[PDB]
Scaffold this active site. Structure first.
Site, PDB file in Angstrom:
ATOM      1  N   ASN A 269      42.307  41.004  44.803  1.00 17.32           N
ATOM      2  CA  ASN A 269      41.540  41.020  43.187  1.00 17.32           C
ATOM      3  C   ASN A 269      42.850  42.275  42.948  1.00 17.32           C
ATOM      4  O   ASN A 269      42.835  43.521  43.388  1.00 17.32           O
ATOM      5  CB  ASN A 269      40.222  42.189  43.355  1.00 17.32           C
ATOM      6  CG  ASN A 269      40.589  42.133  41.410  1.00 17.32           C
ATOM      7  OD1 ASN A 269      39.975  41.243  40.939  1.00 17.32           O
ATOM      8  ND2 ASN A 269      39.680  43.014  40.779  1.00 17.32           N
ATOM      9  N   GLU A 270      43.747  41.664  41.945  1.00 21.37           N
ATOM     10  CA  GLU A 270      44.582  42.356  41.113  1.00 21.37           C
ATOM     11  C   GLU A 270      45.848  43.143  41.622  1.00 21.37           C
ATOM     12  O   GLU A 270      45.751  44.425  42.013  1.00 21.37           O
ATOM     13  CB  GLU A 270      43.846  43.266  39.871  1.00 21.37           C
ATOM     14  CG  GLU A 270      43.068  42.388  39.010  1.00 21.37           C
ATOM     15  CD  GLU A 270      43.202  42.954  37.784  1.00 21.37           C
ATOM     16  OE1 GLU A 270      42.179  44.439  37.464  1.00 21.37           O
ATOM     17  OE2 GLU A 270      42.630  42.369  36.935  1.00 21.37           O
TER      18      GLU A 270
ATOM     19  N   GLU B 219      31.186  39.289  38.410  1.00 23.16           N
ATOM     20  CA  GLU B 219      31.076  40.486  39.553  1.00 23.16           C
ATOM     21  C   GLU B 219      29.653  41.477  39.420  1.00 23.16           C
ATOM     22  O   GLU B 219      29.778  41.095  37.964  1.00 23.16           O
ATOM     23  CB  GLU B 219      32.330  41.123  39.900  1.00 23.16           C
ATOM     24  CG  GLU B 219      33.044  42.124  38.153  1.00 23.16           C
ATOM     25  CD  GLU B 219      34.225  43.152  38.019  1.00 23.16           C
ATOM     26  OE1 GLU B 219      34.105  43.711  38.810  1.00 23.16           O
ATOM     27  OE2 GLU B 219      34.799  42.627  37.299  1.00 23.16           O
TER      28      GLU B 219
HETATM   29  O1  LIG Z   1      36.510  42.070  33.666  1.00 20.39           O
HETATM   30  C1  LIG Z   1      36.910  43.238  34.107  1.00 20.39           C
HETATM   31  C2  LIG Z   1      37.903  43.841  35.275  1.00 20.39           C
HETATM   32  O2  LIG Z   1      38.649  43.339  35.135  1.00 20.39           O
HETATM   33  C3  LIG Z   1      40.122  43.059  35.971  1.00 20.39           C
HETATM   34  O3  LIG Z   1      40.714  44.719  35.201  1.00 20.39           O
HETATM   35  C4  LIG Z   1      39.494  43.790  36.818  1.00 20.39           C
HETATM   36  O4  LIG Z   1      39.301  42.637  37.752  1.00 20.39           O
HETATM   37  C5  LIG Z   1      37.976  42.941  36.173  1.00 20.39           C
HETATM   38  O5  LIG Z   1      36.824  43.776  37.641  1.00 20.39           O
END
Ligand SMILES: OC[C@@H]1O[C@@H](O)[C@H](O)[C@H]1O
Ligand SMILES: *[C@@H]1O[C@H](CO)[C@@H](O[C@@H]2O[C@H](CO)[C@@H](O[C@@H]3O[C@H](CO)[C@@H](O)[C@H](O)[C@@H]3O)[C@H](O)[C@H]2NC(C)=O)[C@H](O)[C@H]1NC(C)=O
Ligand SMILES: *[C@@H]1O[C@H](CO)[C@@H](O[C@@H]2O[C@H](CO)[C@@H](O)[C@H](O)[C@H]2NC(C)=O)[C@H](O)[C@H]1NC(C)=O
Ligand SMILES: *[C@@H]1O[C@H](CO)[C@@H](O[C@@H]2O[C@H](CO)[C@@H](O)[C@H](O)[C@H]2NC(C)=O)[C@H](O)[C@H]1NC(C)=O
Ligand SMILES: *[C@@H]1O[C@H](CO)[C@@H](O[C@@H]2O[C@H](CO)[C@@H](O)[C@H](O)[C@H]2NC(C)=O)[C@H](O)[C@H]1NC(C)=O
Ligand SMILES: [Cl-]
Length: 627
Positions: free
Chosen positions: A350-351, A23
């Site tokens: 995500n998450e 990212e």
């Molecule tokens: O790798 C950093 C962060 O860790 C996880 O909380 C997230 O998906 C990411 O953006």
């Protein structure tokens, strides 16, 4: 310990087992992998008539700068312009600089491509040269080129000039500049927009990637690239989420977005540039789609999802669709890639454990729609495995863990007890981030690792032996975060760090590389390591060649002897290669000592029996040929 190696493989090792997680964090995209050298190049997502709108830009001499909402902008996506005014009575060199992302590497072996758009808002008599270049931050010009412009040009016009430095700079404290003659320009104003400066790019891709970083990622032999997040997918609000369509087409038409790590993303590193990089490296994507949640806590209601589900379909069609059957696929073709790209895996959000109340309906509505359009894609759920219970039953889960080095070696049997029931697991983010179990996400003073250490890398390597042993159900695994600009860091530790001029390969990077580059297609069962112990190993073999890769992690402070017994084989090569990564427990590669800890290769005697003493805090790979 005596380790007996079975000749009969237990399962095929996935082609996808080791890869990368990306990212835009720590200026890993803008300022990092994306080769653009100018920061705040197009005034995206800044407020006109503010100091912060001028971030990274500075006057030369008595230039007056302001970022304005242009009455006549270069495009709808780029409503802001740099208003450059030269006072009456001016002389000499007047203009402005961009400081880059904490500098610009100026290398006389490189040709740079500068560009900008300009217009005079007031038709003027100006007739003279516009000069662009690179200078040291003392104003010493290292590269320059110019072209004639005319004050009568009241409509946007692009300037494209190459730059050839006369000398490499002694450091990265250099700036891009634009200048005119102050007397010629006296009393006049020029509007500028959409600046760019590129070095030579990886694979000479237009709008491509920074060579040293890209090569470093390719060096690790990754098989996949998970993108575009991570938190940076999600946005803080629905409106600020990542959107694929805002990332494709002309840079004029990319509005940028406020990302999830405190800075504006240009979206210059957009979907097509990602896909081209995969083509250039042989990686396959694990592509995330936004799933109706953003980091401020808002879930879209179930009856709100349809346009967002369509946007996800559009995103995937851009990647794989037939250009004759959808507008996004036609767009891919129109941008020079009529052939579909590969896409086998899509991650839904995500998450979403942070939004596990709403994920059941978001998952259901997204996956049923996406699976209907794309029956060959495997969709990956992001909640904690099996809690909540999802419908449809996920084929895959993405598991993330940030923990202590010790936790990683203590948890190398994480997957051993999982049922084999058709579900595969993606360890899509993991890292040993801290020595402080009580405050993992704390400060460096409180045990957070500024950089991976030998301790962290060897703990991770122990865990990785369990990923490889369990690679009947573990299909993919990526450290996170991948990249760090040392001048703009929101998260440590990171796999690969850099400044404007060089790269630092971490201890963890080497553990990743040793695992990924030395990986067969067959898993060879062996004597199990002690569950909870510091010493771990995993053995694979290349069916075509008989190359056999014995990977050993000693994540503890004691050296440990291993005797390998390969008597089940017909033949074992009389020598092998040994690659070892080791050093003091807390040693790191840092900007000041970037090659403190590097692997060492040697030749060792091998055969049906051999003994290796695995040093304290070491990752070792022994390669032999077996038949
Ligand atoms: O790798 C950093 C962060 O860790 C996880 O909380 C997230 O998906 C990411 O953006
Ligand atoms: C990328 O594609 C998406 C999908 O088309 C674009 O988002 C869409 O943008 C339009 C115009 O903003 C939104 O329309 C507005 O909707 C609201 C409320 O429902 C209404 O008040 C306005 O009058 C207008 O109709 C639309 O909702 C939105 N769709 C989604 C899924 O977000 C986006 O603009 C495109 N980005 C670029 C840079 O082209
Ligand atoms: C100034 O920039 C121009 C434009 O990039 C350079 O001229 C280009 O040079 C390349 C290499 O020969 C050619 O392929 C292009 O066709 C040229 N374009 C034009 C419009 O001439 C020029 O060489 C640069 N000059 C300096 C001093 O760096
Ligand atoms: C694969 O095996 C796991 C482990 O038994 C199953 O996980 C259980 O799922 C149910 C709901 O379906 C939960 O209530 C349990 O807590 C889960 N157990 C654990 C240990 O996590 C999973 O259902 C199985 N999946 C399939 C496809 O058969
Ligand atoms: C970007 O980061 C680098 C690395 O941390 C900075 O360079 C270091 O600066 C400290 C404090 O000045 C020195 O003690 C180190 O010796 C420097 N290390 C190296 C390898 O040079 C650099 O100053 C930062 N750049 C900016 C613009 O802030
Ligand atoms: Cl620890």
């Amino acid at each position: 310990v005596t380790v007996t190696v079975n000749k009969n493989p237990s399962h095929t090792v996935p082609s996808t087992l080791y890869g990368l997680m990306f990212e835009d964090i720590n200026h890993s995209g803008d300022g990092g992998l994306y080769a653009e050298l100018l920061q705040n190049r197009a005034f995206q997502q800044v407020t006109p008539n503010t100091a912060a709108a001028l971030a990274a830009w500075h006057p030369i001499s008595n230039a007056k700068l302001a970022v304005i909402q242009d009455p006549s902008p270069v495009s709808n996506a780029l409503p802001n312009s740099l208003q450059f005014s030269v006072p009456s009575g001016s002389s000499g060199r007047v203009g402005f600089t961009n400081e880059g992302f904490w500098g610009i590497k100026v290398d006389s072996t490189w040709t740079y491509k500068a560009s900008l758009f300009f217009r005079f808002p007031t038709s003027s008599s100006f007739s003279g040269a516009l000069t662009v270049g690179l200078q040291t931050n003392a104003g010493r010009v290292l590269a320059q080129n110019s072209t004639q412009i005319r004050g009568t040009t009241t409509k946007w016009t692009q300037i494209n000039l190459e730059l050839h430095p006369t000398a490499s700079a002694p450091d990265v404290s250099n700036s891009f500049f634009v200048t005119i003659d102050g007397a010629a320009g006296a009393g006049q104003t020029i509007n500028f927009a959409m600046f760019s400066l590129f070095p030579p790019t990886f694979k000479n891709r237009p709008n491509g990637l920074r060579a040293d970083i890209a090569e470093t990622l390719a060096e690790m032999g990754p098989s996949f690239f998970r993108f575009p997040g991570g938190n940076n997918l999600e946005g803080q609000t629905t409106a600020t989420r990542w959107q694929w369509n805002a990332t494709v087409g002309s840079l004029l038409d990319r509005p940028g977005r406020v990302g999830d790590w405190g800075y504006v993303n240009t979206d210059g590193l957009g979907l097509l540039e990602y896909l081209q990089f995969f083509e250039d490296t042989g990686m396959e994507p694990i592509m995330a789609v936004w799933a109706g949640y953003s980091l401020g806590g808002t879930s879209l209601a179930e009856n709100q999802l349809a346009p967002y589900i369509q946007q996800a379909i559009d995103q995937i069609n851009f990647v794989i669709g037939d250009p004759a059957k959808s507008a996004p696929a036609a767009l891919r073709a129109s941008l020079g890639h009529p052939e579909p790209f590969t896409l086998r895996f899509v991650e839904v959000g995500n998450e979403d454990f942070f939004a596990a109340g709403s994920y059941p309906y978001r998952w259901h509505d997204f996956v049923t729609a996406l699976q209907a359009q794309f029956p060959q894609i495997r969709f990956i759920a992001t909640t904690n495995a099996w809690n909540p219970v999802l419908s449809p039953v996920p084929q895959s889960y993405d598991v993330h863990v940030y923990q202590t080095p010790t936790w990683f070696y203590q948890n190398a049997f994480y997957y051993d007890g999982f049922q084999r029931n058709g579900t595969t697991y993606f360890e899509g983010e993991y890292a040993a981030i801290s020595t402080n179990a009580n405050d993992l996400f704390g400060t460096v003073a409180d045990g957070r690792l500024a950089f991976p250490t030998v301790q962290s890398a060897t703990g991770e390597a122990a865990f990785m032996t369990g990923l490889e042993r369990n690679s009947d159900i573990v299909f993919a695994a990526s450290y996170a975060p991948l990249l760090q600009h040392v001048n703009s860091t929101q998260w440590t530790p990171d796999l690969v760090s850099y400044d404007a001029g060089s790269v630092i390969k971490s201890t963890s990077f080497f553990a990743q590389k040793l695992f990924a580059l030395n990986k067969g297609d067959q898993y060879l069962p062996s004597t199990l390591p002690t569950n909870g112990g510091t010493l771990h190993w995993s053995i694979t073999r290349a069916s075509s060649s008989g190359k056999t890769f014995i990977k050993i992690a000693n994540a503890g402070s004691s050296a440990q002897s291993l005797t390998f017994q390969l008597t089940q084989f017909n033949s074992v090569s009389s020598t092998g290669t040994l690659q070892v990564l080791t050093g003091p427990e807390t040693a790191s590669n840092t900007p000041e000592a970037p090659q403190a800890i590097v692997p060492k290769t040697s030749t060792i005697g091998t055969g049906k029996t051999f003994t290796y003493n695995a040093p304290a805090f070491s990752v070792s790979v022994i390669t032999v040929t077996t038949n």
